[model samples]
Target: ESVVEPKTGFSFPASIGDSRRLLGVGLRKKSLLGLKNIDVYAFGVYADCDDVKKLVGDKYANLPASEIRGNKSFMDDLMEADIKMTIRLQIVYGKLNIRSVRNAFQESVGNRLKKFGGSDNDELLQSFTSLFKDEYKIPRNSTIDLTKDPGHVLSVAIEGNHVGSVKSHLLCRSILDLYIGEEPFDKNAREDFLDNAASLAFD
Candidate 1:
């Protein structure tokens, strides 16, 4: 998990889990940036998790009410929960049941997330979902490939105060801002990605 250091503007990737309270604090603040939600499929990324439990407690990975069953809110909550690197760590390194449920929902939405078209989108989403769920594998890069189809788009949440639909295809890169590739939909988001690189700690 990563944290963008406040004031310093330096971010560290998978940098630290020093404390549950600290991570939780970082998480709560970033969530206000509307980072709480973002659909992420690669569960393995958190396989490398060494924190979550350290801070948020064992219940740290607990599923929110929405994920217990399928409903629009489930997707809404999932995307918004992806605040900072620590937040995604919460999703990735979440409890076993939560992770499985997360997969189901991710695949469920991926199936519906529009790519080239109906059937075309189906193929890409299904393939991508299968590659992740079945093999529990994904690109080493933390970034999600909405670039699969330039026209690809998915309903996401980033609006202020309210949960609304977003042309997510234009977004979706920067999990850790590891390196740069093509800029995100807004083009301006690329900096936000890297800016998250603020050194979270002395590390």
Candidate 2:
């Protein structure tokens, strides 16, 4: 049997269970011709399978589609205004200084920022950086003092199973690196990284 070493997950003052498992994938047919595609099962929600059946059975299911449950939609557009989305910000354990991004690189999501596996990693990292662009509007390798930034809405992950932080400058520099070195940061890439992310660690 294969074991998921260091099984990832987290707990917080959140609504659902502190522990969460990755929603599994199941294929559905687009037409009777057996055309098939996959979707992450909307598990642990409205637990009544009958309710889902009711919706799928209704003519509304065939209504003009304003939205599609595509993969990128979950990765990039997952963070809507109302629902709290996890953002891995750079956190320094010590005071900021000239040596921070260099010596103070102990933080930032970095390798912990699990994104798409294999060659898909690059694309996921690009999307992750865009999220920061939309919110902070800071160029790569810039300091972000969200304490004064009104657009900063996502919570800084600092509490929980493992209190972790990311040094944004270091992370940005890593992103800007001409040579591929440090791994990119992304919380939504893996099936369970978010469930075990810094947000989940927040007190």
Candidate 3:
């Protein structure tokens, strides 16, 4: 089964091949010529349902949904826990280039790294973005999967091909923060993610 983003009309699987569940989906938009917003990509946030339940089931089982969603400590714990979570991005822009992709990561992820790890994290950011080389043709419909595997490893894959992985807890947290943190790219998607994630404890 698949879920469709209303604005971009891009479809994402309902589940990550039965291992992870899609908690939320959203459209990544970029402004064109300062006139209108264009759909750059569609993304879905997936989490290993079983792992999530195991991590917080006992502690949050009785908590109200709103309270759970509002709990910063709970979110932090989820980000810090050795759980499997993935942010799947499907390119929708027709003329997408790899340079822009690397630049975009530098701008967005750079801020996060600075926020969390300070100014000395340039090497880490460079190493991470360098994985997206110029040869990778990110044409329309190319899929980029960013997975935070167990042991704090952040793996990157393009079009189902493994590119590289980095073993850094802060890197994983920073990548995931773009989707589920306090200031997410998509507010509605973050809310949906938090709502579904909170419901897992009671499931």
List clash counts for every candidate, in order: 14, 8, 0
- Candidate RMSDs in Å, in order, are 18.2, 16.7, 1.8
lDDT of 2 by residue, 1-203 (tens): 11221212111222223322222211111122456532211111101123222332342244222222322333222221122222222222223343333222222333433321243344444444443332322222232311101232322222222222333332332332211122322212343432222122222
Per-residue lDDT tens digits for candidate 3, residues 49-133, read: 8888877765566677678778878877787788899999998889977778778879888889989986799899988977776
Instruction: Quote each prediction's TM-score.
Output: 0.26, 0.23, 0.91
Error of 2 at 125 (Å): 20
Ten contiguous residues with the weakest lDDT in model 3: 56-65
What is each predicted model's overall lDDT from 0 to 1?
0.29, 0.26, 0.85
Candidate 1 local distance difference test against the native: 0.29
Better of 2 and 3 by TM-score: 3
What is the RMSD of candidate 2? 16.7
Query: Which candidate do you rate higher for TM-score, 1 or 2?
Result: 1
* RMSD (CA, angstroms), candidate 1: 18.2
> Which one wins on TM-score?
3
Off by over 4 Å in 1: 1-11, 14-93, 102-112, 133-203
